[PDB]
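Handout for the seminar on molecular recognition.
Each group receives one record of this type.
Step one: identify the two inputs.
Step two: read the structure output and locate the region that could contact chloride ion.
Step three: write two sentences on what you found, then compare them with the reference statements printed after the record.
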Amino acid sequence: LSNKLTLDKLDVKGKRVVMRVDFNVPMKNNQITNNQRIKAAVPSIKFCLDNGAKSVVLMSHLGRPDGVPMPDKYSLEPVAVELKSLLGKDVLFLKDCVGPEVEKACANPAAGSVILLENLRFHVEEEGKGEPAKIEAFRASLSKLGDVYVNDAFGTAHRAHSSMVGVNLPQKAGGFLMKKELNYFAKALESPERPFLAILGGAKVADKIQLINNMLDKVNEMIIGGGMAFTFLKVLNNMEIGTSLFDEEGAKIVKDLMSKAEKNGVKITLPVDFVTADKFDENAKTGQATVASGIPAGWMGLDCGPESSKKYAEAVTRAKQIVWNGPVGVFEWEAFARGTKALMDEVVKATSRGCITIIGGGDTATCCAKWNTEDKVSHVSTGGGASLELLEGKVLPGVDALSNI
Ligand SMILES: Nc1ncnc2c1ncn2[C@@H]1O[C@H](COP(=O)(O)OP(=O)(O)O)[C@@H](O)[C@H]1O
Ligand code: ALF
Ligand SMILES: [Cl-]
Ligand SMILES: [Mg+2]
């Protein structure tokens, strides 16, 4: 961020600060299961208050409500409660993020006010699909809520969304989390230790399958696991995949990706066996399958099996550096957690013998919280997709939109 305004050089005295954060925290049974992302923003928030900010107005998305209000399902209200405990200051939660009422609440607040707005993605203008003059008006409304802007939303920095690139204030500064994460990656990605392994799992198949092409120019091995694998196996192996996650568009590039991996000498490790489920539920009936057997119709692969874990372990053993985004099964549910646990065990062991190990993402970092490995790997990032986009070698839109020095 040498070329960008950052918070250390932003005069906040008597200024209202409007701050984009990534508070897209994981939730199970209605409760926050990991406050990592909230804690991570506290240094920037406290710095603003300690240096005389009139207010700090915090804004984030939560999940993918796709531009419809879904307060029953994706409200940020529970955040606002957690943030109080972590800050040691109270926080006022607003039930919207624009409108005349939000604008009044933020126009002239009492000294030291911390305000959290409701989920930005309840409005289609944030993404904005899920409307050009309404996008302008949305961006204009957010811009009224502060005198200066800070973006600390590392985990969202890959998204050219209204709150991330569209705020129109004179000073647009990178926050301390943005800086810490970008600095860590700049150093780790400059001359990676090799073999450099990427582990790509998770559930955001449509988006993340599109990152593989450029990642194949940077890494020496790739594990393609979790929900990502089934698109590959359907195409390459003619495997029956049942109701497992599948991306029609990404299927069309699978063979080209494998051709490129071969051209670039990148070893691809796909799973060979699975724990299956009869529905997407923690208490689903379960089974087992191999690539050869296929997955029965109406069943989904929600974890890898033991032979896959062995192949993943082999790749981790060869690695001198690892970047991991996306669990290799639905680790939130114990029936489907073994593959991710086993991989975590391997990644911790790799770290202990000198491997540089980087785990990132809202959900993947929660694997570290669950199994108490946050201090047993080299770096746990609040960015997952954002970190993969750095790995590709791109400038992130949320960084690009900051003020130049
Ligand atoms: N085979 C699978 N089918 C469906 N979901 C999966 C599978 N494997 C992993 N997942 C899910 O992937 C989710 C996380 O993916 P993603 O959001 O892309 O990662 P991150 O949060 O680290 O950026 C987890 O909630 C996990 O349950
Ligand atoms: F769910 Al992510 F990076 F894609 F935290
Ligand atoms: Cl996606
Ligand atoms: Mg996630």
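Reference statements: The longest helix spans residues 36-50. The longest strand covers residues 16-20.
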